PDB file of C-alpha atoms in Angstrom:
ATOM      1  CA  UNK A1094     -74.464  71.257 -25.803  1.00  0.00           C
ATOM      2  CA  UNK A1095     -72.340  70.555 -28.875  1.00  0.00           C
ATOM      3  CA  UNK A1096     -68.777  69.239 -28.516  1.00  0.00           C
ATOM      4  CA  UNK A1097     -65.903  68.326 -30.851  1.00  0.00           C
ATOM      5  CA  UNK A1098     -65.379  64.686 -31.747  1.00  0.00           C
ATOM      6  CA  UNK A1099     -63.406  62.192 -29.620  1.00  0.00           C
ATOM      7  CA  UNK A1100     -62.222  58.720 -30.685  1.00  0.00           C
ATOM      8  CA  UNK A1101     -63.700  56.075 -28.401  1.00  0.00           C
ATOM      9  CA  UNK A1102     -62.499  52.962 -30.210  1.00  0.00           C
ATOM     10  CA  UNK A1103     -59.352  52.916 -32.308  1.00  0.00           C
ATOM     11  CA  UNK A1104     -58.933  50.242 -34.992  1.00  0.00           C
ATOM     12  CA  UNK A1105     -56.860  47.181 -34.157  1.00  0.00           C
ATOM     13  CA  UNK A1106     -54.364  45.492 -36.469  1.00  0.00           C
ATOM     14  CA  UNK A1107     -55.891  42.705 -38.569  1.00  0.00           C
ATOM     15  CA  UNK A1108     -54.519  39.687 -40.409  1.00  0.00           C
ATOM     16  CA  UNK A1109     -57.101  37.891 -42.465  1.00  0.00           C
ATOM     17  CA  UNK A1110     -57.107  35.253 -45.165  1.00  0.00           C
ATOM     18  CA  UNK A1111     -57.819  35.957 -48.847  1.00  0.00           C
ATOM     19  CA  UNK A1112     -61.441  35.011 -49.338  1.00  0.00           C
ATOM     20  CA  UNK A1113     -62.506  36.203 -45.902  1.00  0.00           C
ATOM     21  CA  UNK A1114     -64.377  39.426 -45.096  1.00  0.00           C
ATOM     22  CA  UNK A1115     -62.831  41.819 -42.620  1.00  0.00           C
ATOM     23  CA  UNK A1116     -63.864  44.545 -40.258  1.00  0.00           C
ATOM     24  CA  UNK A1117     -61.748  47.502 -38.975  1.00  0.00           C
ATOM     25  CA  UNK A1118     -63.241  49.031 -35.896  1.00  0.00           C
ATOM     26  CA  UNK A1119     -63.717  52.665 -35.157  1.00  0.00           C
ATOM     27  CA  UNK A1120     -66.130  54.512 -32.874  1.00  0.00           C
ATOM     28  CA  UNK A1121     -66.436  58.234 -32.002  1.00  0.00           C
ATOM     29  CA  UNK A1122     -68.480  60.470 -29.743  1.00  0.00           C
ATOM     30  CA  UNK A1123     -69.480  64.013 -30.468  1.00  0.00           C
ATOM     31  CA  UNK A1124     -72.396  66.377 -30.714  1.00  0.00           C
ATOM     32  CA  UNK A1125     -73.522  66.884 -33.427  1.00  0.00           C
ATOM     33  CA  UNK A1126     -72.969  63.159 -34.098  1.00  0.00           C
ATOM     34  CA  UNK A1127     -69.649  62.918 -35.944  1.00  0.00           C
ATOM     35  CA  UNK A1128     -69.212  61.465 -39.420  1.00  0.00           C
ATOM     36  CA  UNK A1129     -66.554  58.783 -39.802  1.00  0.00           C
ATOM     37  CA  UNK A1130     -64.180  58.611 -42.764  1.00  0.00           C
ATOM     38  CA  UNK A1131     -61.355  56.175 -43.339  1.00  0.00           C
ATOM     39  CA  UNK A1132     -57.903  56.656 -44.864  1.00  0.00           C
ATOM     40  CA  UNK A1133     -55.435  54.155 -46.246  1.00  0.00           C
ATOM     41  CA  UNK A1134     -51.885  55.452 -46.613  1.00  0.00           C
ATOM     42  CA  UNK A1135     -53.590  58.761 -45.990  1.00  0.00           C
ATOM     43  CA  UNK A1136     -55.970  58.344 -48.971  1.00  0.00           C
ATOM     44  CA  UNK A1137     -59.740  58.536 -48.428  1.00  0.00           C
ATOM     45  CA  UNK A1138     -61.404  55.099 -48.758  1.00  0.00           C
ATOM     46  CA  UNK A1139     -64.636  54.809 -50.709  1.00  0.00           C
ATOM     47  CA  UNK A1140     -67.549  53.124 -48.929  1.00  0.00           C
ATOM     48  CA  UNK A1141     -71.011  52.080 -49.993  1.00  0.00           C
ATOM     49  CA  UNK A1142     -72.280  55.309 -48.466  1.00  0.00           C
ATOM     50  CA  UNK A1143     -70.137  57.217 -50.982  1.00  0.00           C
ATOM     51  CA  UNK A1144     -70.828  54.866 -53.915  1.00  0.00           C
ATOM     52  CA  UNK A1145     -73.253  51.885 -53.827  1.00  0.00           C
ATOM     53  CA  UNK A1146     -70.806  49.854 -56.033  1.00  0.00           C
ATOM     54  CA  UNK A1147     -68.155  49.613 -53.279  1.00  0.00           C
ATOM     55  CA  UNK A1148     -67.237  46.264 -51.764  1.00  0.00           C
ATOM     56  CA  UNK A1149     -66.828  48.106 -48.476  1.00  0.00           C
ATOM     57  CA  UNK A1150     -69.582  48.899 -46.005  1.00  0.00           C
ATOM     58  CA  UNK A1151     -69.463  51.642 -43.396  1.00  0.00           C
ATOM     59  CA  UNK A1152     -71.338  50.235 -40.373  1.00  0.00           C
ATOM     60  CA  UNK A1153     -73.620  52.407 -38.106  1.00  0.00           C
ATOM     61  CA  UNK A1154     -70.769  52.784 -35.609  1.00  0.00           C
ATOM     62  CA  UNK A1155     -68.419  53.812 -38.380  1.00  0.00           C
ATOM     63  CA  UNK A1156     -66.491  50.525 -38.504  1.00  0.00           C
ATOM     64  CA  UNK A1157     -65.241  49.545 -41.946  1.00  0.00           C
ATOM     65  CA  UNK A1158     -66.437  46.164 -43.279  1.00  0.00           C
ATOM     66  CA  UNK A1159     -64.724  44.666 -46.353  1.00  0.00           C
ATOM     67  CA  UNK A1160     -67.046  42.235 -48.107  1.00  0.00           C
ATOM     68  CA  UNK A1161     -63.943  40.890 -49.921  1.00  0.00           C
ATOM     69  CA  UNK A1162     -60.236  41.592 -49.402  1.00  0.00           C
ATOM     70  CA  UNK A1163     -58.955  42.606 -52.786  1.00  0.00           C
ATOM     71  CA  UNK A1164     -55.437  41.166 -53.187  1.00  0.00           C
ATOM     72  CA  UNK A1165     -54.545  39.898 -56.602  1.00  0.00           C
ATOM     73  CA  UNK A1166     -51.249  39.780 -58.385  1.00  0.00           C
ATOM     74  CA  UNK A1167     -51.463  43.190 -60.045  1.00  0.00           C
ATOM     75  CA  UNK A1168     -53.901  44.945 -57.736  1.00  0.00           C
ATOM     76  CA  UNK A1169     -54.547  44.895 -54.050  1.00  0.00           C
ATOM     77  CA  UNK A1170     -56.377  48.028 -52.976  1.00  0.00           C
ATOM     78  CA  UNK A1171     -57.229  46.875 -49.422  1.00  0.00           C
ATOM     79  CA  UNK A1172     -54.073  45.881 -47.487  1.00  0.00           C
ATOM     80  CA  UNK A1173     -52.228  48.745 -45.806  1.00  0.00           C
ATOM     81  CA  UNK A1174     -52.205  51.218 -42.943  1.00  0.00           C
ATOM     82  CA  UNK A1175     -55.553  52.672 -41.896  1.00  0.00           C
ATOM     83  CA  UNK A1176     -56.856  55.532 -39.755  1.00  0.00           C
ATOM     84  CA  UNK A1177     -60.433  56.654 -39.084  1.00  0.00           C
ATOM     85  CA  UNK A1178     -61.214  60.387 -38.715  1.00  0.00           C
ATOM     86  CA  UNK A1179     -64.342  61.650 -36.952  1.00  0.00           C
ATOM     87  CA  UNK A1180     -65.672  65.100 -37.869  1.00  0.00           C
ATOM     88  CA  UNK A1181     -68.344  67.581 -36.869  1.00  0.00           C
ATOM     89  CA  UNK A1182     -68.641  71.388 -37.356  1.00  0.00           C
ATOM     90  CA  UNK A1183     -66.505  71.925 -34.220  1.00  0.00           C
ATOM     91  CA  UNK A1184     -63.549  69.794 -35.261  1.00  0.00           C
ATOM     92  CA  UNK A1185     -61.900  66.475 -35.963  1.00  0.00           C
ATOM     93  CA  UNK A1186     -60.397  63.540 -34.071  1.00  0.00           C
ATOM     94  CA  UNK A1187     -58.145  60.971 -35.731  1.00  0.00           C
ATOM     95  CA  UNK A1188     -57.598  57.378 -34.606  1.00  0.00           C
ATOM     96  CA  UNK A1189     -54.348  55.594 -34.027  1.00  0.00           C
ATOM     97  CA  UNK A1190     -53.334  53.590 -37.113  1.00  0.00           C
ATOM     98  CA  UNK A1191     -53.967  49.920 -37.725  1.00  0.00           C
ATOM     99  CA  UNK A1192     -52.538  47.614 -40.376  1.00  0.00           C
ATOM    100  CA  UNK A1193     -54.792  45.400 -42.477  1.00  0.00           C
ATOM    101  CA  UNK A1194     -53.054  42.357 -43.815  1.00  0.00           C
ATOM    102  CA  UNK A1195     -53.714  39.309 -45.914  1.00  0.00           C
ATOM    103  CA  UNK A1196     -52.276  36.095 -44.488  1.00  0.00           C
ATOM    104  CA  UNK A1197     -50.079  33.941 -46.728  1.00  0.00           C
ATOM    105  CA  UNK A1198     -48.785  30.338 -46.616  1.00  0.00           C
ATOM    106  CA  UNK A1199     -46.717  28.743 -49.383  1.00  0.00           C
ATOM    107  CA  UNK A1200     -47.497  25.143 -50.419  1.00  0.00           C
ATOM    108  CA  UNK A1201     -43.857  24.224 -50.656  1.00  0.00           C
ATOM    109  CA  UNK A1202     -41.309  23.882 -47.743  1.00  0.00           C
ATOM    110  CA  UNK A1203     -38.136  26.001 -47.319  1.00  0.00           C
ATOM    111  CA  UNK A1204     -36.123  22.948 -46.374  1.00  0.00           C
ATOM    112  CA  UNK A1205     -37.437  19.375 -46.226  1.00  0.00           C
ATOM    113  CA  UNK A1206     -36.119  16.903 -43.637  1.00  0.00           C
ATOM    114  CA  UNK A1207     -33.464  14.382 -44.729  1.00  0.00           C
ATOM    115  CA  UNK A1208     -33.279  10.589 -44.612  1.00  0.00           C
ATOM    116  CA  UNK A1209     -31.224   9.338 -41.645  1.00  0.00           C
ATOM    117  CA  UNK A1210     -29.674   5.917 -41.135  1.00  0.00           C
ATOM    118  CA  UNK A1211     -28.427   5.280 -37.608  1.00  0.00           C
ATOM    119  CA  UNK A1212     -27.858   2.474 -35.080  1.00  0.00           C
ATOM    120  CA  UNK A1213     -29.880   1.710 -31.918  1.00  0.00           C
ATOM    121  CA  UNK A1214     -28.936   4.075 -29.040  1.00  0.00           C
ATOM    122  CA  UNK A1215     -27.354   6.689 -31.250  1.00  0.00           C
ATOM    123  CA  UNK A1216     -29.001  10.125 -31.654  1.00  0.00           C
ATOM    124  CA  UNK A1217     -31.237  10.822 -34.680  1.00  0.00           C
ATOM    125  CA  UNK A1218     -31.599  14.497 -35.598  1.00  0.00           C
ATOM    126  CA  UNK A1219     -33.939  15.916 -38.231  1.00  0.00           C
ATOM    127  CA  UNK A1220     -33.940  19.597 -39.220  1.00  0.00           C
ATOM    128  CA  UNK A1221     -36.782  21.457 -40.925  1.00  0.00           C
ATOM    129  CA  UNK A1222     -37.728  24.950 -42.109  1.00  0.00           C
ATOM    130  CA  UNK A1223     -41.294  25.734 -43.118  1.00  0.00           C
ATOM    131  CA  UNK A1224     -42.411  27.995 -46.010  1.00  0.00           C
ATOM    132  CA  UNK A1225     -42.296  31.758 -45.615  1.00  0.00           C
ATOM    133  CA  UNK A1226     -45.633  32.880 -44.250  1.00  0.00           C
ATOM    134  CA  UNK A1227     -47.505  35.601 -42.436  1.00  0.00           C
ATOM    135  CA  UNK A1228     -48.031  34.984 -39.639  1.00  0.00           C
ATOM    136  CA  UNK A1229     -44.847  32.888 -39.429  1.00  0.00           C
ATOM    137  CA  UNK A1230     -45.613  29.184 -39.810  1.00  0.00           C
ATOM    138  CA  UNK A1231     -45.132  27.300 -36.509  1.00  0.00           C
ATOM    139  CA  UNK A1232     -43.707  23.751 -36.711  1.00  0.00           C
ATOM    140  CA  UNK A1233     -44.929  20.241 -35.786  1.00  0.00           C
ATOM    141  CA  UNK A1234     -43.939  16.685 -36.789  1.00  0.00           C
ATOM    142  CA  UNK A1235     -45.438  13.393 -37.994  1.00  0.00           C
ATOM    143  CA  UNK A1236     -44.239   9.796 -38.053  1.00  0.00           C
ATOM    144  CA  UNK A1237     -46.200   7.342 -40.245  1.00  0.00           C
ATOM    145  CA  UNK A1238     -49.427   9.435 -40.058  1.00  0.00           C
ATOM    146  CA  UNK A1239     -49.463  10.179 -36.312  1.00  0.00           C
ATOM    147  CA  UNK A1240     -48.393  13.391 -34.539  1.00  0.00           C
ATOM    148  CA  UNK A1241     -45.116  13.529 -32.628  1.00  0.00           C
ATOM    149  CA  UNK A1242     -45.227  15.199 -29.185  1.00  0.00           C
ATOM    150  CA  UNK A1243     -42.072  16.053 -27.162  1.00  0.00           C
ATOM    151  CA  UNK A1244     -44.345  15.424 -24.133  1.00  0.00           C
ATOM    152  CA  UNK A1245     -42.224  12.329 -23.866  1.00  0.00           C
ATOM    153  CA  UNK A1246     -38.755  13.482 -22.931  1.00  0.00           C
ATOM    154  CA  UNK A1247     -36.810  11.042 -25.049  1.00  0.00           C
ATOM    155  CA  UNK A1248     -37.687  13.337 -27.949  1.00  0.00           C
ATOM    156  CA  UNK A1249     -36.693  16.993 -28.063  1.00  0.00           C
ATOM    157  CA  UNK A1250     -38.510  19.320 -30.453  1.00  0.00           C
ATOM    158  CA  UNK A1251     -37.159  22.872 -30.578  1.00  0.00           C
ATOM    159  CA  UNK A1252     -36.654  25.339 -33.400  1.00  0.00           C
ATOM    160  CA  UNK A1253     -36.482  23.343 -36.605  1.00  0.00           C
ATOM    161  CA  UNK A1254     -34.634  20.522 -34.846  1.00  0.00           C
ATOM    162  CA  UNK A1255     -36.265  17.241 -33.904  1.00  0.00           C
ATOM    163  CA  UNK A1256     -33.854  15.140 -31.756  1.00  0.00           C
ATOM    164  CA  UNK A1257     -34.173  11.512 -30.599  1.00  0.00           C
ATOM    165  CA  UNK A1258     -31.406  10.964 -28.015  1.00  0.00           C
ATOM    166  CA  UNK A1259     -31.278   7.153 -28.166  1.00  0.00           C
ATOM    167  CA  UNK A1260     -32.807   5.668 -31.286  1.00  0.00           C
ATOM    168  CA  UNK A1261     -35.066   2.602 -30.830  1.00  0.00           C
ATOM    169  CA  UNK A1262     -35.889   0.240 -33.713  1.00  0.00           C
ATOM    170  CA  UNK A1263     -39.524   1.298 -33.111  1.00  0.00           C
ATOM    171  CA  UNK A1264     -38.400   4.805 -34.263  1.00  0.00           C
ATOM    172  CA  UNK A1265     -37.777   3.593 -37.846  1.00  0.00           C
ATOM    173  CA  UNK A1266     -40.402   5.280 -40.017  1.00  0.00           C
ATOM    174  CA  UNK A1267     -41.597   8.053 -42.319  1.00  0.00           C
ATOM    175  CA  UNK A1268     -40.996  11.564 -40.950  1.00  0.00           C
ATOM    176  CA  UNK A1269     -42.617  14.755 -42.202  1.00  0.00           C
ATOM    177  CA  UNK A1270     -42.309  18.268 -40.830  1.00  0.00           C
ATOM    178  CA  UNK A1271     -45.599  20.168 -40.758  1.00  0.00           C
ATOM    179  CA  UNK A1272     -46.180  23.906 -41.347  1.00  0.00           C
ATOM    180  CA  UNK A1273     -49.049  25.803 -39.842  1.00  0.00           C
ATOM    181  CA  UNK A1274     -50.441  29.296 -39.788  1.00  0.00           C
ATOM    182  CA  UNK A1275     -54.002  30.690 -39.865  1.00  0.00           C
ATOM    183  CA  UNK A1276     -54.129  29.806 -43.589  1.00  0.00           C
ATOM    184  CA  UNK A1277     -53.817  26.004 -43.222  1.00  0.00           C
ATOM    185  CA  UNK A1278     -51.574  22.940 -42.781  1.00  0.00           C
ATOM    186  CA  UNK A1279     -48.720  22.176 -45.171  1.00  0.00           C
ATOM    187  CA  UNK A1280     -46.759  18.889 -45.174  1.00  0.00           C
ATOM    188  CA  UNK A1281     -43.105  18.365 -46.184  1.00  0.00           C
ATOM    189  CA  UNK A1282     -42.022  15.382 -48.292  1.00  0.00           C
ATOM    190  CA  UNK A1283     -41.557  12.274 -46.142  1.00  0.00           C
ATOM    191  CA  UNK A1284     -38.186  11.398 -44.588  1.00  0.00           C
ATOM    192  CA  UNK A1285     -36.926   7.885 -43.820  1.00  0.00           C
ATOM    193  CA  UNK A1286     -35.321   7.177 -40.515  1.00  0.00           C
ATOM    194  CA  UNK A1287     -33.616   3.807 -40.749  1.00  0.00           C
ATOM    195  CA  UNK A1288     -32.236   2.004 -37.648  1.00  0.00           C
ATOM    196  CA  UNK A1289     -29.402  -0.531 -37.801  1.00  0.00           C
ATOM    197  CA  UNK A1290     -28.328  -3.262 -35.308  1.00  0.00           C
TER     198      UNK A1290
END
């Protein structure tokens, strides 16, 4: 016996990089088998099943596959809020909405660290702020090519602050703050800690 459609899988939010394909999931049940149609900002989205020229494929399940995420300066027709709608003669079911998003990481830091000159046993503090990014760029540090870990308690890394409680001469070196999101790494310009005594 025939029954109205029901959404089985709603689409989940998606951040993806420019250059990468993407898939928004949807799945319905119904008898007769429901058709699946997608809407972005409440506007019907063309698929290859509508028009062979589309860069978007509607998969057998009704998920929406973007062969390329269009996001240029002056047009970006793919990022936004999406909903799938399942239909048969008996009715319609709509999904919850999902955002589709292109990740972004700037090459150039919000605030570079600063040279510090300090004497043995005195605190050395370096502050950093990474580029704007989505998702937000998390922070790490490097001295003369090698990662810094706060695994060793004499260094405190927290927020944008790197603190060395009691400077050692062996702490003299080139410091860079590193910026990281799904897009890639980004390195600040190098900072000189100098240690007197």
